């Protein structure tokens, strides 16, 4: 079972939109050196929806290559179709992925039983650990805590990325699960709160720019040192807020660019962070001591 | 130009989930017989999400063939990736569709400037009539009235399916644009009001089970017959509500089965209408004398 800081790594791109393989190579290296505990390849933050299916596999492949078995690697393989989700997960398995993260089908609004039958099908079709992923604001659907508990029975559904940022509800989730599957915060602002409550880690967007900090915040929070957790997190607290001035990964991508770590490439319908924000961000980055 | 009752046609399926061609064919013919003004092939209602690209095309082409030029055909070609929406659209033109309905990118939450760039890129890349389609509940984004007004300036972005169901906001939109671009309703229960206030039609779900009734309702409301429109619509008002008791097209596909027009095939993550709504729906279809 994966624990700690799990970065939702962006997918670096050259000015013309092509994947920047070198920055990625160096980004992966940097994370391991910095304390990052795991990496989610081609998730939402990784611009999964604008990458060629081939690009999808190549990215997973490159990351697993550079990672070199040092830290676990999770590949994003969620899709709003069930046939399609199995296909992408089968592949992840074959590429050597430690586990897979699958966001609840988006846009087509399946029912609760739909979400159940959907993951049950994928669990049965592929023998790879699966991490569920709920984010109502983006998907148009909310996987109820009850449905999650049902799915937690399945031997290879190992966790859930709860990105609601509703901590009380996360408290109830963690309590109801009786440990049957891990829980990850999918909301950087509250993550430390969720781990103090029992969550196993943070599938972090912030970890993209403060991998070391997020790594200690996760350690300490998991250890239930509420005192040291709040303290360590206050330091990067503003980051958690400013990285969403515009939809993720728009801001973190720029943040990284200002850190001289990657270029300005980002694919439509996504755009480069809007001017107005570029300065406040540079300020937030300076205050936090990353620049 | 394209006006009236536009059916967002379901994609019939055999018990094993395969596209049921013959049933579809009979459906299209039927719609033409009963008075439907045009057809949306492979929209949300047509299960776009769960049909391979090859099936996308096959379905758009069978429908164009069987229509045999008698009513315009609109191909649903939306996608959340801009370059890939361009492909789907190219294909629709090449296959001879009269227009393309494109939902706003879903899940990846583009900004407004992104929605603008997204649509502008597609309009310039394909010379075919394009219709926007806003439906925040599913997509996670909300194309703003302002933004839609901006895109109307583009010669071939000719309309917008407004599924908000917000009449005030819809009427404001209609006024804001001169007949600069069409406005189609995407909420069956408010459509009659929307058309009365200026809309040019209704990209309908209920049109799947009451094709002629809706023809009439649309014709009358477009004629601005407030009173005939209100009574003609009451005879099917419940249908509008009950057909959404569970995510569309789950209910409409079952209604169509209970009318012995289609089989029960439906693809995961979607499922057959839940047991508990079947009789209430049978009762709904009898009340409106559909069976």
Tokens for B43? 């929209």
* Cβ neighbours of A120 in B, within 8 Å: none
CA trace torsion A133, B249, B263, B272 (10° rounding): 40
The answer to whether the CB of A268 falls within 8 A of the CB of B118 is yes
C-alpha span between A150 and B172 (Å, rounded):
45
What experimental approach yielded this model? Answer: X-ray
Burial of residue A190, with CB atoms counted within 10 A of its CB: 0-12 exposed, 13-18 middle, 19 or more buried = buried
The answer to whether the CB of A275 falls within 8 A of the CB of B113 is no
Name the active-site residue from B61, B161, B184, B253. Answer: B161
Which residues face B44 on adjacent strands?
none
Give the B-side interface with A, CB within 8 Å. 44, 47, 49-50, 52, 80-84, 103, 105-111, 113-115, 117-118, 121, 137-140, 246-247, 250, 267-271, 274
Residue A250's nearest CA partner among B148, B114, B1, B159 is B114
Residue A16 burial (CB count, 10 A): 7
Residue A281's nearest CA partner among A259, A256, A261, A255 is A255
Q: Using the beta-carbon criterion (under 8 Å), do A108 and B44 form an inter-chain contact?
A: yes
Q: How far is CA A9 from CA A28, A59, A136, A286, in A?
A: 8, 11, 21, 22
* Cβ neighbours of B246 in A, within 8 Å: 111
From B249, which residue of chain A is nearest by alpha-carbon distance?
Answer: A108
Helices B226-242 & B275-287 angle (0-180, nearest 10): 160
Tokens for B286? 């009898």
Q: What is the 3-state secondary structure (H, E, C) of chain B?
A: CCCEEEEECCCCECCCCCECHHHHHHHHHHHHHHCCCEEEECCCCCCHHHCCHHHHHHHHHHHHHHHCCCCCEEEECCCCCHHHHHHHHHHHHHCCCCEEEEECCCCCCCCHHHHHHHHHHHHHHCCCCEEEEECHHHHCCCCCHHHHHHHHCCCCEEEEEECCCCHHHHHHHHHHCCCCCCCEECCHHHHHHHHHCCCCEEEECHHHCCHHHHHHHHHHHHCCCHHHHHHHHHHHHHHHHHCCCCCCCHHHHHHHHHCCCCCCCCCCCCCCCCHHHHHHHHHHHHHCCCC
* Cβ neighbours of B111 in A, within 8 Å: 246-247, 250, 271, 274
C-alpha span between B146 and A191 (Å, rounded):
36
Tokens for A58? 């190549």
* Cβ neighbours of B108 in A, within 8 Å: 44, 47, 49-50, 138, 247, 269-270
Residue A161 annotated among the catalytic residues of the structure: yes
The beta-carbon neighbor of B118 closest among A109, A118, A269 is A269
The beta-carbon neighbor of B247 closest among A82, A111, A250 is A111
Residue A25 burial (CB count, 10 A): 15
Task: Detail the residues of A annotated as belonging to a binding site for Mg(2+).
Answer: 104
Rounded to 5 degrees, what angle do the CA atoms A73, A56, A8 make?
45
Domains annotated on chain A, with CATH: 1-291 (3.20.20.70)
User: Which residue in A110, A268, A277 has the most chain B C-beta atoms within 10 A of its own C-beta, making it the best mutation to test that interface?
Assistant: A268
Resolution (angstroms) stands at 2.8
Name the active-site residue from A116, A119, A133, A184. Answer: A133
From B114, which residue of chain A is nearest by alpha-carbon distance?
Answer: A269
* Cβ neighbours of A270 in B, within 8 Å: 108, 110, 114
Q: How far is CA A118 from the centre of its chain?
A: 21
Q: Using the beta-carbon criterion (under 8 Å), do A82 and B50 form an inter-chain contact?
A: yes
C-alpha span between A217 and A233 (Å, rounded):
6
The answer to whether the CB of A15 falls within 8 A of the CB of A264 is yes
Helix (H) or strand (E) segment spanning residue A5 = strand A4-7
From B268, which residue of chain A is nearest by alpha-carbon distance?
Answer: A82
Helix (H) or strand (E) segment spanning residue A238 = helix A226-242
Rounded to 5 degrees, what angle do the CA atoms B61, B13, B133 make?
60
User: Which residue in B19, B80, B84, B107 has the most chain A C-beta atoms within 10 A of its own C-beta, making it the best mutation to test that interface?
Assistant: B107
């Amino acid at each position: 079972t994966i624990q700690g800081s799990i970065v939702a790594i962006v997918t670096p791109m050259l000015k013309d939109g092509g994947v920047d393989w070198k920055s990625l190579e160096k980004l992966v290296e940097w994370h391991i050196e910095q304390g990052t505990n795991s990496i989610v390849a081609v998730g939402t933050t990784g611009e999964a929806s604008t990458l060629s299916m081939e690009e999808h596999t190549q990215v997973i492949k490159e990351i697993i290559r550079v990672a070199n078995k040092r830290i676990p690697i999770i590949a994003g393989t969620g899709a709003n179709s069930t046939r399609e989700a199995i296909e992408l997960t089968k592949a992840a398995k074959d590429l050597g992925a430690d586990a897979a993260l699958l966001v609840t089908p988006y846009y087509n609004k399946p029912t609760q039983e739909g979400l159940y039958q959907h993951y049950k099908a994928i669990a049965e079709a592929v023998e790879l650990p699966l991490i569920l992923y709920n984010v109502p604001g983006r998907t148009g659907v909310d996987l109820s805590n009850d449905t999650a508990v049902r799915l937690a029975e399945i031997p290879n559904i190992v966790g859930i990325k709860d990105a609601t940022g509703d901590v009380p509800r996360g408290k109830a989730l963690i309590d109801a699960l009786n440990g049957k599957m891990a829980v990850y915060s999918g909301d950087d602002e509250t993550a430390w709160e969720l781990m103090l409550l029992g969550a196993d880690g943070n599938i972090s967007v912030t970890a993209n720019i403060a991998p070391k900090a997020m790594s200690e915040v996760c350690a300490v929070a998991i250890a239930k040192d509420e005192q040291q957790a709040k303290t360590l997190n206050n330091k990067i607290a503003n980051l958690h807020n400013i990285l969403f001035c515009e939809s993720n990964p728009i801001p973190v991508k720029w943040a990284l660019h200002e850190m001289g770590l990657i270029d300005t490439g980002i694919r439509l319908p996504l755009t480069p962070l809007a001017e107005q924000y570029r300065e406040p961000l540079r300020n937030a980055l300076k205050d936090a001591g990353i620049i």
